[PDB]
């Protein structure tokens, strides 16, 4: 009865790039990225409770890690921008949610970036294959972080021989962005629509550090919540004297509490609806 | 090597209503509906080739049958309006397509009204069921006539025990209406969208006898074709001296040819696309 569902998305990317790119590899050793990373991981794994103080401590270790390596990524690895930096928040959510198993009372197989099921459609080759074994496509969207189940989907026609696809059915999906612009918000908007049709009980969050939007009015349809972890606008970053606010631990605490509440609930509970008088509660 | 895939949707409805409603039952005997029906069926089954002349003859038998029983339905059974009349065209398409098996070279299981697959979504009860055996819903739309395959869809979670649903995957879908108004056209419009997403190679037709639309500009998006079999507007029907044009056999011939052409084709054929230079041909 435990978990051991940690994948270390960011560590894996550091290892890849180290081998995939030697030049990166040189920078990582010279500027101590691998030891800063190992320290972040060790410190996170050492925080085992999930009361408010513990969560603030995880966020303090995250702030330290980003303060260490982000300046190296930004100034000494131009090519490795969205190759290494985005996976840091993803790995952070792997730590934050690594101890849900005993609380929720089940072993959750998916706690990492994954392709969340969106739809099934049939594209048979001809009439004979339509009858015998209809070809199909399962559509899925990459999300930066999913908590969810894995399932096998099988289709069989008259021929009787099945074709199976493995899918991921999210209970929570989180996108992680360094800043939130307009083209990416619209893309999340349209993804949230598809996701709530595929999986109406999936909570969908957008998490950003900085907000980079103009006058334009955004559409927040079906996105459950959007976080701006540093309470800063992205234009501040290039100004003389800029100093980044730290990622706000209070917001991570909020997010952690919202996720747990969602995981612990029966999502459609008719008798509860009737007793309450309202289908959705606080 | 044959077919025997006829279901007699309309005959079945006559039998139901006869037992479900005795009053109907009385009218059917008194006004000879059952013998007119048996004659239509016998005459249709006797036309076995599918050259143009044979198809015109099937349509002549259809015209005769409707000339016989529609006035009885309209004037002596108010309740049984869309209870018995709509199934006549459906049964007609059962006859027209009853001899496709040898041409297409496969036994097509579905040639009758059915629920055509639209989508699969997951609505798990709780986190434990999400992991172990995620509850799901398959959405489907009733169509007045489908030519297509039947398939079994299975979902399995960590528990390993599958849940199966039987579905219908249409290659052709036809809606049959006595007249085409605005609320029903819009409903078909929105269904065609869903259907082309679920099954992009399904041909979707709307077949009506009369057109009952005003100035309003209709949206014909993704509907492959709409037929007005009597080349009449629905307002003509209540005028003194009105006489209905017969259902036009030339239009049924067109429809028959379009369906067969579609059934005989490979729907996505890359090398054919490349050779032709255009993905869609005449």
Author numbering:
A (entry chain A), B (entry chain A): 3 to 284
Reported in the publication:
Purified samples of wild-type BbvCI, containing a 1:1 ratio of R1 and R2 subunits yielded crystals under acidic conditions (pH 4.5) in the presence of an excess of duplex DNA oligo containing the target site, and 2 mM calcium chloride. The crystals of the native protein diffracted strongly to 2.1 Å resolution, and belong to space group C222, with three subunits (1 +1/2 dimers) in the asymmetric unit. We initially calculated MIR phases, built an initial structure, and conducted refinements using datasets corresponding to the latter (heavy-atom) space group, and then subsequently determined the final, higher resolution structure of the native (non-derivatized) protein in the original C222 space group via molecular replacement and phase extension. The resulting electron density maps clearly corresponded to two full-length protein chains, but no density corresponding to DNA was present. In contrast, modeling the electron density as a homodimer comprising two copies of the R2 subunit resulted in satisfactory values for Rwork and Rfree (0.189/0.249, respectively), excellent correlation of the model to experimental electron density, and significantly improved geometric quality. The dimensions of the homodimer are ∼100 Å × 50 Å × 50 Å. The molecule is saddle-shaped due to deep concave surfaces at the dimer interface, and there is no obvious region of contiguous positive surface charge that might accommodate a DNA duplex of seven or more base pairs. Within each R2 subunit, the PD-(D/E)XK catalytic site occurs in its customary position, at the termini of adjacent beta-strands in the core domain. However, the two sites in the protein dimer are located ∼45 Å apart from one another–too far away from each other to catalyze double-strand cleavage reactions producing a 3-base overhang.
BbvCI, a Type IIT restriction endonuclease, recognizes and cleaves the seven base pair sequence 5′-CCTCAGC-3′, generating 3-base, 5′-overhangs. BbvCI is composed of two protein subunits, each containing one catalytic site. Either site can be inactivated by mutation resulting in enzyme variants that nick DNA in a strand-specific manner. Earlier mutagenesis of these residues confirmed their catalytic nature and demonstrated that the site in the R1 subunit cleaves the bottom strand of the target site, while the site in the R2 subunit cleaves the top strand.
